[PDB]
Motif scaffolding. Sequence first.
Motif, short mmCIF file in Angstrom:
data_model
loop_
_atom_site.label_atom_id
_atom_site.label_comp_id
_atom_site.label_asym_id
_atom_site.label_seq_id
_atom_site.Cartn_x
_atom_site.Cartn_y
_atom_site.Cartn_z
N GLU A 332 0.83 -1.20 0.00
CA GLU A 332 0.00 0.00 0.00
C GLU A 332 0.87 1.25 0.00
OE1 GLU A 332 1.16 -1.53 2.12
OE2 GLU A 332 1.10 -0.72 4.16
N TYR A 333 1.95 1.24 0.78
CA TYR A 333 2.81 2.41 0.83
C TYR A 333 3.52 2.62 -0.50
CZ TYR A 333 6.55 5.58 2.16
OH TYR A 333 7.41 6.64 2.23
N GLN A 334 4.15 1.57 -1.02
CA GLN A 334 4.70 1.64 -2.36
C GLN A 334 3.61 1.95 -3.38
OE1 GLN A 334 7.44 1.28 -0.14
NE2 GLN A 334 8.25 1.19 -2.24
N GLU A 335 2.36 1.67 -3.03
CA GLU A 335 1.21 1.94 -3.87
C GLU A 335 0.53 3.24 -3.49
OE1 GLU A 335 2.25 -0.40 -2.35
OE2 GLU A 335 2.71 -1.94 -3.85
N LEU A 336 1.14 4.02 -2.62
CA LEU A 336 0.56 5.26 -2.13
C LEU A 336 0.67 6.29 -3.24
CD1 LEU A 336 -0.66 6.44 0.52
CD2 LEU A 336 1.68 6.90 1.26
N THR A 337 -0.42 6.46 -4.00
CA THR A 337 -0.37 7.18 -5.27
C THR A 337 0.30 8.55 -5.11
OG1 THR A 337 -1.73 8.15 -7.02
CG2 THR A 337 -2.74 7.95 -4.83
N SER A 338 1.45 8.70 -5.76
CA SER A 338 2.38 9.77 -5.39
C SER A 338 1.86 11.14 -5.81
CB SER A 338 3.74 9.49 -6.02
OG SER A 338 3.66 9.58 -7.43
N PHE A 339 1.76 11.39 -7.11
CA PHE A 339 1.36 12.73 -7.52
C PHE A 339 -0.07 13.02 -7.12
CE2 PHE A 339 -0.62 15.74 -10.45
CZ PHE A 339 0.18 16.83 -10.21
N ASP A 340 -0.95 12.02 -7.16
CA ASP A 340 -2.29 12.22 -6.64
C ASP A 340 -2.22 12.81 -5.24
OD1 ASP A 340 -3.41 11.13 -8.94
OD2 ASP A 340 -3.33 9.09 -8.13
N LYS A 358 10.12 11.84 -0.85
CA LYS A 358 11.57 11.73 -0.92
C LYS A 358 11.98 10.33 -1.37
CE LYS A 358 15.19 14.33 -0.66
NZ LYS A 358 15.28 15.50 -1.57
N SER A 359 11.32 9.31 -0.83
CA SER A 359 11.42 7.99 -1.43
C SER A 359 10.80 8.06 -2.82
CB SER A 359 10.69 6.97 -0.56
OG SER A 359 9.31 7.28 -0.47
N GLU A 360 11.65 8.16 -3.83
CA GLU A 360 11.21 8.79 -5.07
C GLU A 360 11.52 8.01 -6.34
OE1 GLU A 360 13.14 10.06 -7.53
OE2 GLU A 360 15.14 9.76 -6.69
N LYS A 361 12.27 6.91 -6.29
CA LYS A 361 12.60 6.20 -7.52
C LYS A 361 11.34 5.93 -8.34
CE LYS A 361 12.67 2.25 -9.95
NZ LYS A 361 11.55 1.31 -10.19
N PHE A 362 10.31 5.39 -7.70
CA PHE A 362 9.05 5.20 -8.40
C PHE A 362 8.33 6.52 -8.64
CE2 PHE A 362 10.06 1.32 -6.14
CZ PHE A 362 9.90 0.37 -7.12
N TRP A 363 8.63 7.54 -7.85
CA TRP A 363 8.07 8.86 -8.09
C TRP A 363 8.74 9.58 -9.25
CZ3 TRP A 363 9.95 13.99 -6.62
CH2 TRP A 363 8.98 14.99 -6.82
N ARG A 364 10.06 9.46 -9.37
CA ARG A 364 10.73 9.97 -10.57
C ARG A 364 10.41 9.13 -11.80
NH1 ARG A 364 14.01 5.87 -13.13
NH2 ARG A 364 15.02 4.69 -11.45
N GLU A 365 10.05 7.86 -11.62
CA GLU A 365 9.72 7.01 -12.76
C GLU A 365 8.76 7.70 -13.71
OE1 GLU A 365 8.36 3.41 -11.00
OE2 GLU A 365 10.16 2.27 -11.53
N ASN A 366 7.94 8.61 -13.19
CA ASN A 366 6.97 9.36 -13.99
C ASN A 366 7.07 10.85 -13.71
OD1 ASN A 366 5.85 9.70 -11.51
ND2 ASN A 366 4.02 8.47 -11.91
N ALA A 367 8.24 11.31 -13.26
CA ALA A 367 8.44 12.74 -13.06
C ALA A 367 8.20 13.51 -14.34
CB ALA A 367 9.85 13.00 -12.53
N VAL A 368 8.39 12.86 -15.49
CA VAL A 368 8.03 13.48 -16.76
C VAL A 368 6.59 13.95 -16.72
CG1 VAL A 368 9.76 12.37 -18.19
CG2 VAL A 368 7.64 11.15 -17.63
#
Length: 452
Positions: A332-340, A358-368
């Motif tokens: 769920e945390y890794q699934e905690l919809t980031s930009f939403d 800050k835990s962001e690898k998956f958040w930068r994955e779509n930083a575009v």
Amino acid sequence: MGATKILMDSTHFNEIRSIIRSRSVAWDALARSEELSEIDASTAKALESILVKKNNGKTLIPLIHLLSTSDNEDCKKSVQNLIAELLSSDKYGDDTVKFFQEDPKQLEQLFDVSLKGDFQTVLISGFNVVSLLVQNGLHNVKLVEKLLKNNNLINILQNIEQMDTCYVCIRLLQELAVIPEYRDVIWLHEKKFMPTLFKILQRATDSQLATRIVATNSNHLGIQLQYHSLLLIWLLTFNPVFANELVQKYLSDFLDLLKLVKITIKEKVSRLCISIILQCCSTRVKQHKKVIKQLLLLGNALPTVQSLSERKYSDEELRQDISNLKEILENEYQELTSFDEYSSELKSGRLEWSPVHKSEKFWRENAVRLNEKNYELLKILTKLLEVSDDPQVLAVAAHDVGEYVRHYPRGKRVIEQLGGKQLVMNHMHHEDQQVRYNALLAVQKLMVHNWE
């Protein structure tokens, strides 16, 4: 089959029992004031004799006579001991409870002082009360309804500096609240003594092996107390309403409950210490997906919570659920919809460190997709950045600036819309370490990125 035998463990709960059994006063004269009978006079004095082994029941009639006669203070608990021991005699059995349970009135005259008066009074009293109450051939509910509300009994459950009283108060409760009938109802009555448990565990903050005052501590009592407390507290909760309420009632008090095993544990704690939080997250109740968020946010032990998992433990019965804990806790945390969530909290205007970002690898994955969004509300975050008073907001401003480390330099020119180097410089002069640690990273980003 019939009535069981319970609580052969303690010494405090067992000391006065021997104090009374070992000796015995001669009742031959005790029928002279008519505390005893005159026609059925061969049984009351016949205690130690009828205690022996020789060749249901054969005296069920007379006993009620002196039971009724029992309407004064002292001998109450000596006779209570007598009843307890004799009913703990398999040869003479206990099937006479099926005769008592027609409409037990032996209890009432023993009640309105039991749970009250002197300590040892209630201590001796409670045993048969509960050990027969458990028998269900008739409503015991009203009986416990009387037994619940008292005045001194609350003290018997309040003596916390001395732990002898609540100990039994709750061990007998454990043997009591097993059946839902009494479980739920009694929970409907005791919603103020949780502090009992709280001290029963909070003591461990400072501890040492060879210290404090206890003799024969936990062979059967010292932390058998904690065993009781925890097992009851979780045991009772299985009505979904229970935990559903308690969680919102005392989130924090059971927040550090995680600490129960953070440092120290022993044999029986393992299965239980977090087996309630098990229920605190089970997929069968409201808010089963709503609050544990903050549990994790303030805990952060999650890596070390995993670190608890690997060190193999002798028992099978605990590996499944402990694994279950982390697996669900990750999906769920890794699934905690980031930009939403990010844009939501941003537009909220109120913010916390929210370390998800800050835990962001998956958040930068779509930083575009943020570049798509172009984070002009981050242009607004600049406005936020000039004036700040919240350490969390102030520092996360730098963190938010800094995540460019894993982000392409195509953001560098949109940054070039910014770039007055004295801004984050004067901020650097804001040297408050708590933020300064990552303020170094922030002010540093520009130039190494130039390397990047």
